Amino acid sequence: GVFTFQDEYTSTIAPAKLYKALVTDADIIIPKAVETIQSVEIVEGNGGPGTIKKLTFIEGGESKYVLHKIEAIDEANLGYNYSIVGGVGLPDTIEKISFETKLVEGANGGSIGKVTIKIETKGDAQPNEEEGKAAKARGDAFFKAIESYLSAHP
Ligand SMILES: O=C(Nc1ccccc1)Nc1ccccc1
Ligand SMILES: O=C(Nc1ccccc1)Nc1ccccc1
Ligand SMILES: O=C(Nc1ccccc1)Nc1ccccc1
Ligand SMILES: O=C(Nc1ccccc1)Nc1ccccc1
Ligand code: NA
Ligand code: NA
C-alpha cells in the first residue's frame, strides 16, 4: 500500500527562474549553490524522462548520494516528476518513493514549490516520522540555498 504526503516550499525567486535553476541548469547550479552538495553527475539519458542523475552530498561527516530518475517533465507548466532509484533516499526500509512537483506563483512574485510524495515501505512499517521531519528540514535548507544563490547571481 501507498502512503501519500503533500508539502509546500516557498521561495522569493520567480517560478520560471527557479525552474530553470533546478531542472534545466540543475547539473551546474545545484552544486554551485548548495554548500552541502558536492556534485551532480548525469549517468543516463538526455535530460528527458528516464534520465538518472546522481547527487552527492555531505551529512553527519559522511559523503552520501542519491539517484534521481526523471519520471515526467512539463517545462511549459513548471512540472517535474522524479523518483529515487537508489543511494540513501531509497533505504532498505523504502521499496519505492516518488515526487510530483509543480512551481506556482507565490507571494510578491515568488514561488510555491508544491510536492506530492508517494512512498511504499518494506514490510508493515510506516514511513519513519523522524526521517520525514529531517527530510523536510533538508528540503527547506536546499530551497533556501538555491534562493540565496540566485538572488546574488541572476
Ligand atoms: O532536483 C531537485 N528538484 C527539482 C525541483 C524542481 C524541478 C526539478 C527538480 N531536487 C532535489 C532536492 C533535494 C535533494 C536533491 C534533489
Ligand atoms: O524542497 C523541495 N522543493 C521544491 C523545489 C522545486 C520544485 C518543487 C519543490 N523539494 C524537495 C522535496 C523532498 C525532498 C527534498 C526536496
Ligand atoms: O524520506 C523522505 N525523503 C528523502 C528524500 C531524499 C533522500 C532521502 C530521504 N521523505 C519523507 C516524506 C514524507 C514522510 C516521511 C519521509
Ligand atoms: O542533504 C541536504 N540536501 C540534499 C541533497 C541531496 C539529496 C538529499 C538532500 N541538505 C542538508 C541539509 C541540512 C543538513 C545537511 C544536509
Ligand atoms: Na556545493
Ligand atoms: Na509497507
UniProtKB/Swiss-Prot annotation:
Major subcellular location class: cytoplasm
An individual GO BP term: defense response
Family membership noted in the UniProt record: Belongs to the BetVI family.
Chain residues that bind melatonin: Y82
CDD domains: Bet_v1-like (cd07816)
InterPro entries cross-referenced by the UniProt entry: Bet_v_I/MLP (IPR000916), Bet_v_I_allergen (IPR024949), Plant_def-hormone_signal (IPR050279), START-like_dom_sf (IPR023393)
UniProt entry keywords in alphabetical sequence: Allergen, Calcium, Cytoplasm, Hydrolase, Metal-binding, Nuclease, Pathogenesis-related protein, Plant defense
Binding site for trans-zeatin 1: D7, Y82
Any one Gene Ontology molecular-function term assigned to this protein's record: signaling receptor activity
Binding site for Ca(2+): P31, V34, I37
Entry's EC annotation: 3.1.27.-
Annotated Gene Ontology cellular component terms: cytosol; nucleus
Protein name, per record: Class 10 plant pathogenesis-related protein 2B
Region forming the signal peptide: none
Gene behind this protein: PR10.2B
Protein's cellular compartments: Cytoplasm, Cytosol
Residues at which trans-zeatin 2 binds: E59
Binding site for trans-zeatin 3: H68, Y80
Annotated function: Class II ribonuclease (RNase). Binds to several cytokinins including natural adenine-type (e.g. trans-zeatin and kinetin) and artificial urea-type (e.g. N,N'-diphenylurea and N-phenyl-N'-(2-chloro-4-pyridyl)urea) hormones. Interacts with melatonin.
Top-level taxon of origin: Eukaryota
